[model samples]
Target: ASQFFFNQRTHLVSDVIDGAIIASPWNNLARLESDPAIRIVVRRDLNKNNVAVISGGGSGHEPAHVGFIGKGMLTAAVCGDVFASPSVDAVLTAIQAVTGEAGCLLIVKNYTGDRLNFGLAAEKARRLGYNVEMLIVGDDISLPDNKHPRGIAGTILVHKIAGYFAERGYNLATVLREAQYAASNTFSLGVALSSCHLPQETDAAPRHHPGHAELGMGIHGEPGASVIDTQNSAQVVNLMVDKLLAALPETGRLAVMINNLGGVSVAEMAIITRELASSPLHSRIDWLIGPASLVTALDMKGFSLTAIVLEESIEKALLTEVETSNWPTPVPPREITCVVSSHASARVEFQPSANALVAGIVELVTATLSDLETHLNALDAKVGDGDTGSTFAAAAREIASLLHRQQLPLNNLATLFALIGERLTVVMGGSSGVLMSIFFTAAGQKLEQGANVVEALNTGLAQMKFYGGADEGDRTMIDALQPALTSLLAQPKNLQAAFDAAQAGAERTCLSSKALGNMDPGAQALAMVFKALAESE
Candidate 1:
């Protein structure tokens, strides 16, 4: 290894690059020249006899020129500075280094700078007696009716086809023909939420207007042809399909490539895929090539859609597995499928019944808790994070809703208790909620075994206490619940007397020193429910 040298007139050669150079991080990536800087990442086991394939452009579009270089892809890639075309000398170095007696092909994206620079290098290499040729890719259909369209993501397709042919020992003429054929048929359209940010960019360049997207944007940092009202992803995909459909060479069995121009999320790319699959032109699509950043403009929040009318050869080459991680796997455009399930027996279905007393209790308790929500939350905040009020209120709402709809099995206490238990567990969504669910579920079991309502409630409280590890003196809801159930059972018909005893139990709990002298939110809540039930007309 030798140190890279540059011709310097003096000790100070001021750097124009204000930002850090984003070097390719791969260890095997090697330099081709120092003056203009080219990267040659040849495979260690590269077949020397195969006709070599080469492609390149500026640096910012990473994996494009560099990431795709390996045994099954490019022999070497010539990169220029960020978004700038590689120098003629640099492209020539790439050609000379990789091209053997088998000859080589240059795949150039169709931008004026790229065409001139890579074309000049091809000419220079020819003069040096190397059998070198170039294929110019003008795949962008963004600028309609323009003869020299800006090549964008479609260049990657050209690389795939060209590299596939070259690696398979096709002659320069055969590879060049396939590469040119791909470039001519491939059409791409870009839609971007915002503009690209250059590494050395200052505040001088203006951004895209807020809440608007630039449609038909080019790969460089240039503004797009039209500004569109910002819409949902589906609408944007519709616009792209509308534009791309008109330019496609033939209607039948097309392969679609969805490219991330950088800065879009994988989640968002999937959303785009959904919209594309449902688009009006979806019937014509047979294969899906990407949802990947095959080509990009630096951190541009955008995506491009490229459609290639699938020929047998094109389909075979594009779908061929490559060594580069950057190459997105191609898939067939599949209609979303769904199957019916046999698991419906696991779900609970309600059988309706009613009782005035039970309905009255549900109504009164729900209304009382709805009003007590803020206060209970205030108390719970001191002990916990203060969601007890909302949790209870939510459960009350569900129960009250069931009662009001006359769907609650109020006459069937066992069924009602079980439904309440399942509802609390499913919707209340907290440990306390689950405990309430367990209490109701166990009480329902007791009721089903022929226990009276009061006995059922007592049984429920005991199960809660057993599972929940809280006793009456521990200052939990069991404090109020235990006493209330006991007093109810002792004075079987005196609701007023039972209420008094439960009230006394609640008062005792409120004055206790347990849990830093704060009344347990659970106990206070139980007190509220029982007191509401006792006082209700």
Candidate 2:
């Protein structure tokens, strides 16, 4: 059942109207007219003087006809089957049920089925002494006027304007006139990357491939006027704007409705808004209606842009607060806002001094490490990435250059160790670099605390072991470093013994291979560095 679309829950479709109606705050005031065909939800709290505004076409355009049924919106909505206009009887039933002494206004789209059906229903209601007027919305200007533009999302403008006038104790004639004015002035254009899919209809598969878009497509899954390259939000908005701006004269202040046809993301809609708000026509837009789905085409992957030339009355009608959540209250366009970040001042650093002894140590140690690059990399390749040796050699070369250029405070031993730790952490580029950084930094800290060379090195090894999560037996550089530091602490001034212990520890590591029988190359590199340092001494 889960594998099949609408499998066991197909009943939910018809029940959905009842569900929405019952769960509403207006639940006590509204009730479903019928179950299947003439699915009209009529509002019980009707006014005699205020004209009754009723509008609906098909079921698929949800929240359009049904969701707009509230105190300030529609008196009742006559819903039909999916994409099929309601029968004349259903429209007449709605008119008779909801209309009072003032009148009832039926807003119908320009679709043949909708116009004919709603028109006939209006006549039927009129014959029975109910004052009924109908306004046909043909706002989609995707094609030329002779081609008979289909009513797209802009029909909602009529619904809102008619509802606003009617709910405010206006006469039927005034409501109808204002609604007709809005209907005639509004223009809309739609684009989809693909046609819509119909549930329970097996042939409703997508009709597009990658890099394709149907511009000025109809809501009923019909073929579009043009198929162009699938564009980004900016380019798509630009293209749509070009078509829209060309429709009218170099225009007056207009209220733009940015509608999500269906399936476009919220983030995508914001991008569309951002682009439109910065476009060439930005100044012409006085008010904006929505970045919402005022009307949808059953999950079609597209959007429609509706522009209504603003009159003072139309602007007031649009901005008027409505009870329906479907209506995104019109907003005036304003300048976009932004901020800039402030930063702290740079730090002054210590200058280097001439030191022959320190210079010799730097040259020898860096040269030794650089010479071992290929060998250490080869050894590391067995267990991990072969870049360990190159990384160390690069760091050593950088340190050597900095020391030679007097950029490093090598004359001050503790400060030299601290700076080396600080800079190498960034330049070394790996876990091994960070561990070495911790070692030198801890040694510097200990030295500043009045510790001798051996005690400082021992403390440094301790700190490295704690932070690095490695010990003498962990097959890491700490294995060699721990023994070397221990030997140095015991002998106090014997660099030779420290080197010997480090070399012995590395040799011991070579024999003990638990996984794949490879010696820890990091430990071997530490041993080589210790030997080089001892030889320099």
Candidate 3:
């Protein structure tokens, strides 16, 4: 060790950064003076008391292999240039600099260049009487290749666990075993709408339209397994959640690190976090690492998720708050309980009804929705969150499934009302589901009184008004449906005329402005919206 002398007159450092720091974050670190290596800085910190944990590869992953140097992170980061591996000299330098009585550990990724460089460096260190343990982190579960699943984001868990154990004064052997344990259990999968770039390289993205995202892509601009047309980032999160759920543990609180692979915005990440919290992933996740740059691929506009495979005891160490302002949000291991239902009605009951004709209608609606799923959802995306197709399909299926057990032979009207009410309240969700479900229950009870299907439906309309609190002119589906049903009852045989009247009523809402009369409540987000007939003629 030696004392280095340096002096600088007092000046505006922040202003200096503002004046000369032309930061473009496009790819690798294009600095004013230095092309630094990761392993060199890391070797200095890997004292004999700690296992010399080293990891490095692509250069675009900034503050990662570099900035994350301290008490509990990586021991050494052998810097690579852009999307390439570090030189043999660099890797060996890191191994030799840190290997002491306790030994050093090389944390190499499964990439060909990283494996070769670090592997050769490890042998060189061993020949020099320096004990160096090498652990390859291969945790990508995206591909079905036990032969060679691409190592993606799960490597961070290896760094955190190894560093934590090393800081706790564990010998290199103990640290190596623990790190190996985690590496074996840890798995990752990632997706992107685009690709990464090499240092001084221009072509990052080649194809993938505006709504398309790539899955199973390599970190360095390599093509993914497939390109899928995606919607909002939320859609991607949901898809990811399903995939992860299938792959990971079924019943346990989890610790997950969401890594921003260098180019997604904080806003976009927040939306993703919200979606995950509300999704199946939320229940299992006990902690999160970023929305920060962790394992990046040179400005790749994508993200990756990793979990420690779920061990609660290591939470405090893995997620201890740091004074460094650069750290991202992390969650601790604790219990979060939700209220349970013990009410009598909550126990659920089955009511029975029987109506062959109503059953036939239900079957028809079910068939329609199942067939129209994709088209309806595509149409709804322009104005809503989409899934209108699934929503309708779900409701239709519920109606069809319930008709069989409705006790149809008895023709119990009250029983039918109670049954439909109970069934739809759960089966069909959303405002539209409840309203439509309640409408039928009321109408069915009236129909049991010897009224024709039309008269019964009219009675149902009145009850719909009472419950829904809507008038005839409101630009709701009722604007069309009610008129059509009413007209059909009057004419009895004029089904076509009834259909035309329904269409006309639907059209009237477009011209009506915010009229004082009619059924519309003048409120936004009303599920009762009236659409123009599929055809005017």
Candidate 4:
């Protein structure tokens, strides 16, 4: 079953519209004072002297009709229920609200319901002595020869282009001309791994086969043109680009909109962008819009690619800043650049020197940790991600390997501690690794200030506690480390007492409210290290 965070499926569209108005950066949006069923959001600060650009459809493709309502974008958005078109009265209400002496332009997606409702409203508004023009966007190239192509994400390009002209005080005719041109030029296609789940439904049958993707899937969960192996991102993008390019002009520079159909992960979207950038059509592409969820289906696990064969005028229109938060600022595609930092590469040079006792202790601790990996991992699984053991073992193995290679200055306690700190940071993963590194580096600084081993270690423990924000009884390694360090500081030569204190602290973690019945993995690992050191002594 698919879950959604919403209340009253009946009030979903109205609630969403109200939420959007509340979240609008500029407080210029308001819902129509008409019946709640006539869901029309209009700009309260409408400049009636300029052309009013209005758009709407079913509510699922949010940020669409409502999100685009502001200066330099939509003047009004007439929303319908999820995947259902608004009534003629709702569209007329939006037109009458914003249309003035400068007239109004209705930008609609080319769906049967949208065309009929918006088209009929346009006629009625004109009959009421208002200058109104309607532009239907049929940009989806999924069905090549189909006369009424389903408008998908590319409709936003038309919205932006039309909104740009209208906000500039262009007449209704001019806005309509530009919007129609944009609608005709824009070509879009979508690929989906799964169809969207409706908020009102439970346990809907999956539309896509595992490991296969539907190419040219519609926004309203309609079946796609073809199903293909999701084999790889590059291949899938290549197929989508091929279809898009056939409809696109051969020589003109293209403005590509990479739209997420609701649920594609950011990382996957980036990969799709990379693949599109590397596609055959990359050479002619000039501007990139989105790679974002500018338009979406209701949590559809897919993305759509929209390419507009750009003229200088269209490019200017797209680049024109809109007050709406939903429209992504257009950026030209560029090569990824990286800079190397001199400070990051610099490391302190230390001559290797042998100290058998220090080397033996290091060997024992690392060996004990490596051996406890599985045990610690099992314990951590109950409370955390189960990688605590692997992180400790990885750092241990690296340190032991460096010690074996005679790269460590074992005789110089300060330099050895600092080197170990650097090594732990480099090899170990996660917060534990960074915390351990901090402990060693701080302890090394204390040793440099003439502190003995126990005093230096105590200083390290204090620093770790300060930085990690964990202390004794917080169900962390500090529970074991703090007590063990205190025992060592009091009885300097009693390694057994230090080990016993650490073990007892670790054991007490099992009773802690935070840890429930499970011992803290870090505390157990700390106790194991103390035990190994005590045995070696």
State which candidate has the highest TM-score.
4
Candidate 2 Cα deviation (angstroms), residue 53: 1.4
Tens-place lDDT per residue, model 4, 1-537, is 656788988899889987898888877788889987898888888899999988899989977878888888888889999998999998998889878988988888889999999999999999999999888888888877677889889888898888888878888888898888888888999999988878765656557669999987889888878899664899999999998888877789989999999989999999999999999988988889878998899888999999997876888888898888588888999888998666665375699999988999888888989988998898888889888889889999998898899888999999889888877888887888899999999999999999899999999889998889987888889989999999999999999999999999998888864443398889999998999888867
After superposition, the stretches of candidate 4 with alpha carbons farther than 4 Å from their true spots are: 343-349, 352-411, 419-441, 463-484, 491-537
What are the per-residue Cα lDDT tens digits for candidate 2 across 9-101? 445346656666766654533655454555677776767668999888876675677777776678888777678788888898888887898
Q: Write the per-residue lDDT of candidate 1 for residues 209-232, one digit (tens) a residue.
A: 678788877788666677778747
Task: List the candidates ranked by lDDT, beginning with the highest.
Answer: 4, 2, 1, 3
What root-mean-square deviation over C-alphas does model 2 reach? 6.3
lDDT scores in order: 0.77, 0.79, 0.63, 0.87
RMSD of each: 8.3, 6.3, 15.5, 4.9
Best by lDDT: 4
TM-score of every model versus the real structure: 0.71, 0.73, 0.54, 0.81
Clashes of each: 0, 0, 14, 0
* Lowest lDDT block of 10, candidate 4: 510-519
For residues 93-208, write the lDDT of model 3, one tens digit per residue: 77766556778777877888888888888898889998888888887766674477677777766777777787778898988888887777676777776665433324343335
Output the better candidate (1/3) by TM-score.
1
- Ordered from best to worst TM-score, the candidate numbers read 4, 2, 1, 3
Q: What is the lDDT of residue 451 in candidate 2?
A: 76
